[PDB]
Design a protein around this ligand. Structure first.
Ligand SMILES: [Cl-]
Ligand SMILES: [Mg+2]
Ligand SMILES: [Mg+2]
Lengths: 241, 244, 250, 195, 111, 235, 240, 231, 243
């Protein structure tokens, strides 16, 4: 039974190492969510600092890949940083060679192709991570593109990743069934972050403090993460209505 | 490390057999029967396509009979994809020889080269062998008309009439029975088709389940012509010989 | 480090079976149904856009891909394996042909190059076979319209019409009854939509179906004027609206 | 080295090659054989830069002898000449090219015809009735143009060759110490020991 | 253009007696018309009762002596502390010098 | 399966220990060192009477002052001899002198453990290296596939090794002559050999300072065999 | 590159891959070598399971390495071609550098060296081939006959056989071959070689190949009829 | 058990069995003892013979004029590691005109042995070394294990029955460290230490091997009748 | 089963058992700690005195990277050294190209990516060490801890080895009782205490205390070993607290 140890086909036509890499994805027990506004793309993720000895500022699963592109990861931090460093290098090389900033969907495809190679070549293992890329692309506008260990990728109106993804997914599905549009009809990113946090609270059924969340925001020509005080301001506005 | 997963394709059994070569030959025994018959005035190549469909575009299809150069052709039995890798290599060798010596490559030299490539995969590299057996039909000014066969071991032999693929035991007995040395091409054409008609696992031998070819000095004066038969021409020769 | 898997992972079993190729074909069998039909003045390839989630934008995922201006491809099996094959197929069309002969390759030769790549993954060291079956439709000046199937083994066959994947056995039987050598492109598109409806469970419309054709030259899609010999691509992906129009006359 | 001549007559090829080997100031040898037998019915004479000449000739010889054993068959003069040309054409774009000019005289046993090929160091091949390399042609070609006939006997070819050598001995400044003459025909290769 | 060689001047003298040997050399080191040093040792004790001097280009001279002293050391390791005879040392030096046949040590060596 | 360079739980390399078993199956070779010279003798062991026994070369010259005898998978020894000869000649080129017997042996033994996943397995042959140099005089070494070499006053390797070594234990003393050693090798070979010892199925050789390494003629060895028979019948 | 150690020692001190290569030789068609006083004869078995064969073009069992040396074999046919090619190249390389053709012993030592190399190199299996190498050294009239095998050991033989049922024909040769007086003529040597094959072959028709090598590069292969005459004469004397 | 097929595999309790098996080869090897004072460092090694006709395997190797070691285990591995030390000692002298520090020599050996324990295909070294030396910070004694662990000590012993000598040194610690400016007395303490590890056999003239390095003493090995003084 | 025999193989859980087995080697090792203070960091380690023959203060375990980073580790000591050698190459190339000395977070990732790389293939073994490291850069003091998996985080206090639970409990008290912060000289004293308290898990053999520190005020941001009087002062403080 060595067809379960390396990336070769089982009699069922299945790659078990790919399937087990998907299971490693939920090892952190963290749930992430991404949504699109008019002028922005917002990504939120649960922040859990269990040890009091940890420096909480260094505990992060959101990465600044380029000036425009941001990436949140669902999976263990070593594989997350492996993917982050590579995506950064790929985005920088792209700009040098082709003279313009790497689009979010192109980066997602490139990282997905790299992931595909690990599912075919035996010596390389898959990374146990799901990479959600976000930006405000200069051609396509607000963008969410997600990659997994199978090498699969696709664009999203909105998306959710983690142990309780299905609850978040269905919550988001129902909202977009009402509004009948592909985005959050809102001018300011501040309110789109408030929407994201609110709908995660409803889906998960848990309340959040400023240190329980981690937020990333993509606007035209820059991506940035919110501080604990920026999130606190966000939580105050939610509670006051 | 990686050793754990190595099948070790290039090793002897306790009996002194090459496992993978033997299993590749087992694979080839399930392939469509290909027959070659050498006559005094030409060579015949006849081969059976494997359980085809009515929607298969036959006139543009090629799975059995391939052209290496103007003088040499091959009949394939086994993995088609593997055969095409080797065929392109053989086509290049023929052209290299032509460029170097300004003369068309002698048939045996081409056969040896391909057979040596197959041999290499059984002795070194750790890769699986090519699951292919060829029948080489060709002509040169030294030995004239020649029939050879090679198999995954890289061993090749010369023949007057030979079969590869499925039911070779039954086919070779029938050829051994009706073959004679003074035979001609038109007679060999009939023998090849009659042999396939009896050994076939299909209910009846039809034009859409066959590929056919002849290498003839039946070309205007001292020169050789290859003829890859078209679907309509295979249908005509089946009626002529009295099979359909 | 170093890739220490320099040995074949696909090997002949005692029965003469290449296990990994058979298992790759099993993966193709599980895949979503795709099909191809050749007409007298064109070819049509079609498949179902099986959306993994309704939040996902299925337009961003292209199952039908342009390889050259006159050649298109569709698959059944593992999507990621298909995506990298399309990338390699597009590149090999340039490196091993266009940069040599100054023109795009004919369908059969590009198919041959793709097949070679798939064969090598069946014999080379430290790799598994590709888990896809391709259907490549195309046109060229001297061979005309053609349709080819390519399997994980690297074997390829030319077809008048065929289907691969989930409901291929039933679909091929359906195509055998309908196909003839006097079909026009519009008739083939009509048959394609009929055939594809049988294998689809849920929604059946232009947004859940991907369909492209190899047909007449499209000078409107060329992007420039001034060179008479350049008349535009024969490959054209049908829009969501164009599909729905023909579903009313279904 | 200096002078190498070749002439194809009715039924044989005749190659004449100088015997002198000069090292700047002194003539070190006056009996040098500037030729190699490639196969029983194929002879190659050569001239060019020191060392390269013999190194190249023996390298070709070995390759043809290897082919002869492998196939149990003698290559045609045409085939041998093409092989030699390719080697020189490969050589000219190398780091250090072979500076060697050759004449290949052979009798084709299949066609029953003598054949003379002239190939220079660039890989420039020509089939000829008579040929030369270096300054040898400048003196001899006018005599060969006049007297040559395609139906000449071997004895007539030798007489025409003597007239060529005499003209060379009269008008060339260098003393090339005479020539070794060899004949290539259906029976093989033999040396004319008195010339 | 960069010239990798230079002339540090100096003069050395070796004389073989009946049961002794001398290797002498001046201690002046120069470039062109300038004096670098009035006392720069040029003749060296290399062990095993061998003395050596590589006169000419001092950089190559120092490099060679350094490599030979090293060769003596490794001769002891590899061959059980055997004494390197003067004839064996000479042959060893030939190989050190010819090793750089096409980019020579620009020195006249005496042992 | 398992690594080629794997250690056993006892702290031994499996492959080296297994190669030692192959050497035990090999034909007997015996070496005896004296102050007048070192003697090397071997069992030829022809597998059939049609095999021309003089073509069995199990004693070999490395240099004029160094000889070598082998036992085990003798085909494996050819590259070891080639390396030894090259090392001997190369050292003479670099140093204008003969190379020490120990240094030669050490150079050969450096090849031994160059195996892994370099060659694929250890050598399946043991060597008796005998020679002379000015520093340490007449010497006999036993080079194994472990890379270890022991110096010996006398040594036997091959199938009859432990029986022969016990015999060499009793017979050897520091005042042996060359002639005494020759007869002693012949005596012990005859004891351990399956077939009856003669000049065709056994070979002698020696290394002296004056004449260097010499393989003995069958006529010369035959006389020493006849001399042996008479002296054993003498008591 | 593929570096896997295929040829390795076993607990009992055996290299099984080298021993299994010998089993492939045991399966191969019988080959026999007999040297007379002024000639060597190489006999070879052709299994008659394969008829409808083209004997003009089918690879012959005996191969010329040079004009004065020949090589026959038993075992894997494809493997033998690699050894023959290497040997032929080395024969021309020796002539080019030494200005003298190879001795029969040298050529044997080279081929045996190649075979040995494949028993302790990574990523390769041993040759499933044993060879009989025969001929005459340049300017020498003494016959030479050597044998090699997968392990790489080689040795000279007055007469020897390899391949299937070689045990039987070696039995025959051991009682019929006299060293003090070997086959004085070509006839006697060929006769003894055919006789030895007739112990094993089956039919004396196209199943026996004979090649006679004489001094000064005089090598000739006997035809079917010439061999058939020996077969006829042997059995007519036997009927008594 | 299932985790001892190669060096690249941890066991479930976090053990490297191939390294531990390599460690076992040292215990099979013959005993050797190391000890130092503030002025001198001494190696004492019990050499082993194959039989009565054979020589006694050399146990001590010189690396430089100021450094050397004694071995226990696979001798060819000691030759490789000692050769490496010779080169590193030599690189330091040629490039920096500097004698290699004994502590830095240990660091280099540690790192060379480590690479063999983390990579596939290779194997650990099957030998233990006792390095002595005298550098700019005085006398030193190191103990090398093929796991990679190198340890600076006052005295120690490795090989078969080495525990007896190691206990003796542990008692004598306060005495032998004070033997300054007296090489013969320091060697005596080492010969008395190695005597605690002997059973059946005793120290003879061709059995005993001693080395010493110190303040004004180059690394010099004593064998044969040179050590008869200390028997 | 068989998922734990080869490195880089996912089990059906989604776990790499070989990395988890490397952790067992770390847990078997001696106790090492790290304490982040006001303007720097303090490292301390337990050195087991196996025998009287060990020369005191000679077998140094803590290692310096560049001139401003300190590294200490528990588990397989050679693996730790190999990792530090790499760290020194990384820091050297960073300073070569960018002039400035490598920042601590930048340095942390360099080690992290290297250790993570040894979980990607079956041709290599995971590192059998948890490394505690840090120092002072332009943005101030940083303390990190890096595991066999390649996982690392920033820390206020860090501890690993056989007495990690004991140490962690003590570190947690300091964080609670000093929210405004701890001074460098305080941290050295506390580090000595914690190692002494953590020595109860290795109580069979006696031990030797080793401490180092980087501090902007006390060491000018450079890594230095705590020696002589300051070391003895910390040992006295530690010995007073256990009694
Ligand atoms: Cl890509
Ligand atoms: Mg993989
Ligand atoms: Mg010309």
């Amino acid at each position: 039974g060595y067809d379960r140890h390396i990336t070769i086909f089982s009699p069922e036509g299945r790659l078990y190492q790919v399937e087990y890499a998907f299971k490693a994805t939920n090892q952190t027990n963290i749930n992430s969510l991404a949504v699109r506004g008019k002028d922005c793309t917002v990504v939120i993720s649960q922040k859990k600092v269990p040890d009091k000895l940890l420096d909480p500022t260094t505990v992060s699963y959101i990465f600044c890949i380029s000036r425009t592109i941001g990436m949140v990861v669902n999976g263990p931090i070593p594989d997350a940083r492996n993917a982050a460093l590579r995506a950064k290098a790929e985005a920088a090389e792209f700009r040098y060679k082709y003279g313009y900033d790497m689009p979010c969907d192109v980066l997602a495809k490139r990282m997905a192709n790299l992931s595909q190679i690990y599912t075919q070549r035996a010596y390389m293992r898959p990374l146990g991570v799901i990479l959600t890329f976000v930006s405000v692309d200069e051609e396509l506008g607000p963008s969410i593109y997600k990659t997994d260990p199978a090498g699969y990728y696709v664009g999203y109106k909105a998306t959710a990743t983690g142990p309780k993804q299905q609850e978040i997914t269905t919550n988001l599905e129902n909202h977009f069934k009402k509004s009948k549009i592909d985005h959050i009809n809102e001018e300011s990113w501040e309110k789109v972050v408030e929407f994201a946090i609110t709908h995660m609270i409803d889906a998960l059924g848990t309340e959040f403090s400023k240190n329980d969340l981690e937020v990333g925001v993509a606007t035209k020509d820059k991506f940035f993460t919110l501080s604990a005080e920026n999130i606190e301001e966000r939580l105050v506005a939610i509670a006051e209505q | 490390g990686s050793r754990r997963y190595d099948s070790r394709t290039t090793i002897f059994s306790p009996e002194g057999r090459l496992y993978q070569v033997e299993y590749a030959l087992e694979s080839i025994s399930h392939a469509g029967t290909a027959i070659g018959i050498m006559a005094s005035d030409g060579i015949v190549l006849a081969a059976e396509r494997k359980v085809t469909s009515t929607l298969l575009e036959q006139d543009t299809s090629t799975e059995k009979l391939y052209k290496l150069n103007d003088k040499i052709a091959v009949a394939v039995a086994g993995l088609t994809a593997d055969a095409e890798i080797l065929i392109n290599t053989a086509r290049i060798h023929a052209q290299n020889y032509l460029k170097t010596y300004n003369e068309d490559i002698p048939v045996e030299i081409l056969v040896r080269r391909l057979s040596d490539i197959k041999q290499g995969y059984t002795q070194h590299g750790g890769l699986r062998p090519f699951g292919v057996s060829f029948i080489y039909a060709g002509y040169d000014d030294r030995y004239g008309y020649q029939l050879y066969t090679s198999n995954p071991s890289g061993n090749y032999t010369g023949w007057k009439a030979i079969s590869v693929g499925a039911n070779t035991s039954a086919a070779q007995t029938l050829l051994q029975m009706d073959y004679k040395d003074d035979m001609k091409v038109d007679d060999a054409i009939e023998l090849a088709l009659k042999t396939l008609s009896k050994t076939t696992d299909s209910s009846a031998l039809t034009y859409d389940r066959l590929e056919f070819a002849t290498i003839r000095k039946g070309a205007n004066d001292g020169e050789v012509y290859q003829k890859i038969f078209k679907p309509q021409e295979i249908k005509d020769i089946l009626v002529k010989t009295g099979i359909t | 480090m170093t890739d220490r898997y320099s040995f074949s992972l696909t090997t002949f079993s005692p029965s003469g079976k290449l296990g990994q190729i058979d298992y790759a074909l099993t993966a193709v069998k599980q895949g979503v149904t795709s099909l191809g039909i050749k007409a007298t003045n064109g070819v049509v390839i079609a498949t179902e856009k099986k959306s993994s989630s309704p939040l996902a934008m299925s337009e961003t995922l292209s199952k039908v891909s342009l390889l050259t201006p006159d050649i298109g491809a569709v698959y059944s099996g593992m999507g990621p394996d298909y995506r990298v094959l399309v990338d390699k197929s597009r590149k090999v069309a340039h490196t091993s042909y266009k940069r040599i002969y100054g023109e795009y390759p004919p369908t059969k030769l590009l198919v041959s190059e793709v097949a070679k790549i798939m064969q090598e993954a069946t014999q080379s060291g430290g790799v598994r076979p590709f888990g896809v079956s391709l259907l490549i439709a195309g046109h060229d000046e001297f061979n005309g319209f053609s349709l080819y199937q390519v399997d994980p083994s690297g074997s390829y066959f030319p077809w008048k019409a065929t289907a691969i994947g989930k409901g291929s056995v039933a679909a091929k039987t359906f195509l055998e009854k309908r196909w003839n050598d006097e079909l026009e492109l519009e008739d083939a598109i009509h048959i394609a939509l009929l055939t594809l409806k049988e294998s689809v469970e849920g929604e059946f419309n232009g947004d859940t179906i991907e369909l492209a054709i190899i047909g007449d030259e499209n000078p409107d899609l060329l992007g420039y004027t001034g060179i008479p010999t350049d008349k535009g691509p024969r490959f054209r992906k049908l829009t969501s609206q164009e599909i729905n129009d023909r579903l009313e006359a279904l | 080295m200096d002078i190498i001549l070749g002439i194809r007559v009715q039924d044989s090829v005749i190659l004449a090659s100088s015997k002198a080997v000069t090292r700047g100031i002194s003539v070190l040898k006056d009996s040098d054989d500037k030729t190699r037998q490639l196969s029983p019915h194929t002879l190659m004479s050569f001239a060019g830069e020191a060392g390269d000449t013999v190194q190249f000739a023996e390298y070709i010889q070995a390759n043809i002898q290897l082919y002869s054993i492998r196939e149990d068959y003698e290559l045609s003069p045409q085939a041998v000449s093409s092989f030699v040309r390719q080697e020189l054409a490969k050589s000219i774009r190398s780091r250090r090219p072979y500076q060697v000019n050759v004449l290949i005289g052979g009798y084709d046993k299949k066609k029953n015809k003598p054949e003379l090929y002239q190939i220079d160091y660039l890989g420039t091949k020509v089939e000829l009735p008579y040929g030369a390399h270096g300054y040898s042609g400048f003196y001899t070609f006018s005599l060969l143009d006049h007297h040559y006939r395609p139906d000449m006997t071997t004895e007539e070819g030798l007489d025409l060759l003597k007239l060529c050598v005499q003209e060379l001995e009269k008008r060339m400044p260098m003393d090339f110490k005479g020539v070794i003459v060899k004949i290539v025909d259906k029976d093989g290769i033999r040396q004319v020991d008195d010339f | 253009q960069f010239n990798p060689y230079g002339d540090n001047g100096g003069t050395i003298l070796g004389i073989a007696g009946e049961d002794f040997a001398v290797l002498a050399g001046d201690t002046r080191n120069i470039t062109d018309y300038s004096i670098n040093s009035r006392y720069e040792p040029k003749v060296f004790d290399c062990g095993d009762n061998i003395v050596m001097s590589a006169n000419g280009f001092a950089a190559d001279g120092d490099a060679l002596v350094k490599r030979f002293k090293n060769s003596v050391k490794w001769y002891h390791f590899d061959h059980n502390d055997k004494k390197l005879s003067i004839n064996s040392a000479a042959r060893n030096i030939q190989h050190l010098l010819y090793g750089k046949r096409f980019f020579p040590y620009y020195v006249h060596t005496i042992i | 399966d398992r690594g080629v360079s794997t250690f056993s739980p006892e702290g031994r390399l499996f492959q080296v220990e297994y190669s030692l078993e192959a050497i035990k199956l090999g034909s007997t070779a015996i070496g005896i060192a004296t102050k007048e010279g070192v003697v090397l003798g071997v069992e030829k062991r022809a597998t059939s009477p049609l095999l021309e026994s003089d073509s069995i070369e199990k004693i070999v010259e490395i240099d004029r002052h160094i000889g070598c005898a082998m036992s085990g998978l003798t085909a494996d020894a050819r590259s070891m001899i080639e390396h030894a000869r090259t090392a001997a000649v190369t050292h003479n080129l670099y140093y204008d002198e003969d190379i020490n017997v120990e240094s030669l042996t050490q150079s050969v033994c450096d090849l031994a453990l160059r195996f892994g996943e370099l060659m694929s397995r250890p050598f399946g042959v043991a060597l008796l290296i005998a020679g002379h140099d000015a520093d340490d005089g007449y010497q006999l070494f036993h080079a194994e596939p472990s890379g270890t070499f022991y110096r010996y006053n006398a040594k036997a390797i091959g199938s009859g090794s432990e029986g022969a070594q016990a015999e060499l234990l009793n017979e050897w003393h520091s005042s042996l002559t060359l002639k005494e050693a020759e007869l002693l090798v012949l005596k012990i070979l005859k004891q351990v050999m399956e077939e009856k010892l003669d000049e065709n199925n056994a070979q002698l050789s020696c290394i002296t300072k004056q004449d260097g390494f010499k393989i003995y003629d069958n006529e010369k060895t035959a006389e020493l065999i006849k001399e042996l028979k008479e002296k054993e019948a003498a008591e | 590159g593929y570096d896997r150690a295929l040829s390795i020692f076993s607990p009992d001190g055996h290299i099984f891959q080298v021993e299994y290569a010998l089993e492939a030789v045991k399966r191969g068609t019988c080959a026999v070598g007999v040297k007379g006083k002024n000639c060597v004869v190489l006999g070879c078995e052709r299994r008659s399971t394969l008829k409808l064969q083209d004997t003009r073009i089918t690879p012959s069992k005996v191969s010329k390495i040079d004009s004065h040396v020949v090589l026959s074999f038993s075992g894997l046919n494809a493997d033998s071609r690699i050894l023959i090619e290497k040997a032929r190249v080395e024969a021309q390389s020796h002539r080019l550098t030494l200005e003298d053709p190879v001795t029969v012993e040298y050529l044997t030592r080279y081929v045996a060296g190649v075979q040995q190399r494949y028993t302790q190199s990574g990523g390769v299996r041993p040759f499933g081939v044993s060879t009989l190498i025969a001929g005459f050294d340049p300017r020498d009239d003494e016959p030479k006959l050597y044998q090699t095998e997968p392990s790489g050991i080689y040795s000279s033989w007055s007469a020897q056989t390899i391949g299937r049922n070689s045990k039987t024909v070696r039995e025959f040769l051991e009682k019929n071959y006299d060293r003090k007086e070997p086959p004085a003529t070509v006839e006697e040597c060929v006769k003894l070689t055919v006789r030895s094959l007739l112990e094993v072959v089956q039919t004396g028709a196209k199943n026996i190949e004979i090649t006679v090598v004489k001094p000064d590069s005089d090598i000739v292969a006997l035809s079917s009829e010439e061999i058939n005459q020996y077969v006829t004469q042997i059995e007519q004397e036997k009927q008594e | 058990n299932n985790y001892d097929g190669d060096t690249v595999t941890f066991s479930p309790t976090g053990r490297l069995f191939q390294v531990e098996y390599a460690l076992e080869a040292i215990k099979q090897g013959s005993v050797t003892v190391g000890l130092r004072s503030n002025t001198h460092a001494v190696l004492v090694a019990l050499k082993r013979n194959a039989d009565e006709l054979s020589s006694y395997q050399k146990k001590i190797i010189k690396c430089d004029e100021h450094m050397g070691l004694s071995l226990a285990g696979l001798a060819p591995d000691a030759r490789v590691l000692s050769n490496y030390l010779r080169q590193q000692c030599n690189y330091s002298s040629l490039v920096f005109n500097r004698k290699l520090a004994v502590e830095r020599a240990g660091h280099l050996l540690c790192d060379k042995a480590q690479k063999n324990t983390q990579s596939y295909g290779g194997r650990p070294y099957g030998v233990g070394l006792l390095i002595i030396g005298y550098d700019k910070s005085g006398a030193h004694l190191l103990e090398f294990q093929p796991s990679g662990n190198v340890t600076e000590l006052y005295g120690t012993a490795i090989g078969a029955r080495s525990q007896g000598a190691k206990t003796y040194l542990e008692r004598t610690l306060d005495t032998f460290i004070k033997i300054d400016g007296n090489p013969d007395e320091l060697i005596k303490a080492g010969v008395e230490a190695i005597s605690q590890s002997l059973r059946d056999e005793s120290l003879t003239v061709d059995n005993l091997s001693i080395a010493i390095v110190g303040k004004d003493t180059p690394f010099t090995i004593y064998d044969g009748e040179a050590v008869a003084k200390y028997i | 089963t068989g998922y734990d025999l080869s490195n880089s193989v996912f089990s059906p859980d989604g776990r790499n058992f070989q990395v988890e087995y490397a952790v067992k080697a770390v847990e078997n090792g001696t106790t090492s700690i790290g304490i982040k203070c006001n303007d720097g960091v303090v490292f301390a380690v337990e050195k087991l005195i196996t025998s009287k023959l060990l020369v005191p203060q000679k077998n140094v375990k803590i290692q310096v990277v560049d001139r401003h980073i300190g590294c200490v580790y528990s588990g397989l000591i050679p693996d730790g050294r190999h990792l530090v050698n790499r760290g020194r190459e990384e820091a050297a190339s960073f300073k070569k190209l960018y002039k400035t000395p490598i920042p601590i977070p930048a340095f942390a990732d360099r080690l992290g990516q290297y250790v993570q790389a040894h979980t990607l293939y079956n041709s290599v073994r995971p590192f059998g060490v948890s490394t505690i490291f840090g120092g002072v850069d332009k943005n101030g003091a940083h303390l990190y801890m890096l595991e066999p998996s390649g996982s690392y985080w920033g820390y206020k206090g860090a501890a690993t080895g056989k007495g990690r639970q004991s140490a962690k409990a003590e570190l947690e008290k300091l964080v609670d009782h000093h929210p405004e912060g701890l001074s460098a000289r305080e941290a050295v004293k506390q580090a000595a205490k914690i190692i002494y308290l953590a020595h109860e898990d290795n109580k069979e053999k006696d031990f030797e205390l080793e401490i180092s520190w980087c501090s902007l005020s006390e060491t000018n941001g450079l890594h230095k070993f705590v020696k002589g009087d300051l070391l003895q002062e910390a040992i006295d403080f530690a010995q007073k607290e256990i009694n």
